[PDB]
């Protein structure tokens, strides 16, 4: 469980992410799709994109970046009390999208890389540790829902 001091670090940087959700979304999806190409194959709507330049040019990709970050933001601001927000997400990602838990680990690492690139001053090692802990909590709760449904990972 994160302390109140650790949640503050998390939400202090997230308030900067929120100044430009779309640019953040874009960087994070592209980082993920380049680092772990197998993730790109889950998206019929993106599968055609072959280069980084094509990814950067895609308005639909940018739109879906905002979608993801806005959902994640709603969860982070619950400070761990995120039952109502998490449930629908695990359900669709386990059963409809077929997303292994391992990919949620990949996208976590993309989020931490981009926050460190864009926000060094607010994202020192103490902030990075807090954000890793929040993302682990997110992953741990989703994984429990997966298990229930028979999809664990
Ligand atoms: C930070 C974690 C993630 C969050 C907050 C998240 C959130 C969302 C949201 C809110 C939607 C739209 C509503 C829905 O269908 O449930 C969505 C759709 C989807 N997500 Fe995620 N997602 C996450 C991770 C991922 C990852 C890691 C992948 C694939 C590697 C994935 C695959 C998908 C797919 C295939 C769709 C449907 C897109 C479409 O065709 O419209 N998601 N996600």
């Amino acid at each position: 469980v994160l302390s109140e001091g650790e949640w503050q670090l998390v939400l202090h940087v997230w308030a900067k992410v929120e100044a430009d959700v779309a640019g953040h979304g874009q960087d994070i999806l592209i980082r993920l799709f380049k680092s772990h190409p197998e993730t790109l194959e889950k998206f019929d709507r993106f599968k055609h994109l072959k280069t980084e330049a094509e990814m950067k040019a895609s308005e639909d990709l940018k739109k879906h970046g905002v979608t993801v970050l806005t959902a994640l933001g709603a969860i982070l601001k619950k400070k761990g009390h995120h039952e109502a927000e998490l449930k629908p997400l695990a359900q669709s990602h386990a059963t409809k999208h077929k997303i292994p838990i391992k990919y949620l680990e990949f996208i976590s690492e993309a989020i931490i890389h981009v926050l460190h690139s864009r926000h060094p001053g607010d994202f020192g090692a103490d902030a990075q540790g807090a954000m890793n802990k929040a993302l682990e909590l997110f992953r741990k709760d989703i994984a429990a829902k997966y298990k229930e449904l028979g999809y664990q990972g």
Side-chain angles (χ1 to χ4, degrees), residues 32 39 42-43 45 64 67-68 71-72 75 88-89 92-93 97 99 103-104 107 111 138:
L32 173 71
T39 62
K42 285 296 174 171
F43 293 91
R45 86 209 279 108
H64 288 70
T67 287
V68 183
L72 180 66
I75 290 159
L89 207 172
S92 65
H93 287 65
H97 309 317
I99 306 317
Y103 291 10
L104 301 172
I107 195 176
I111 297 181
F138 168 66

Side-chain angles (χ1 to χ4, degrees), residues 8 19 98 107 113 143:
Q8 256 175 66
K98 255 79 240 255
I107 195 176
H113 191 75

Side-chain angles (χ1 to χ4, degrees), residues 85-138:
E85 290 72 11
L86 194 140
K87 176 144 158 194
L89 207 172
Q91 287 170 196
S92 65
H93 287 65
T95 79
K96 169 73 101 36
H97 309 317
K98 255 79 240 255
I99 306 317
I101 287 295
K102 184 84 192 164
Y103 291 10
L104 301 172
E105 177 181 18
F106 297 153
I107 195 176
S108 295
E109 292 304 318
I111 297 181
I112 284 162
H113 191 75
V114 167
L115 297 193
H116 184 72
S117 299
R118 291 194 165 226
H119 310 284
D122 284 290
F123 207 59
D126 57 330
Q128 180 182 167
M131 179 68 68
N132 188 57
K133 280 181 55 158
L135 291 174
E136 289 184 316
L137 177 62
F138 168 66

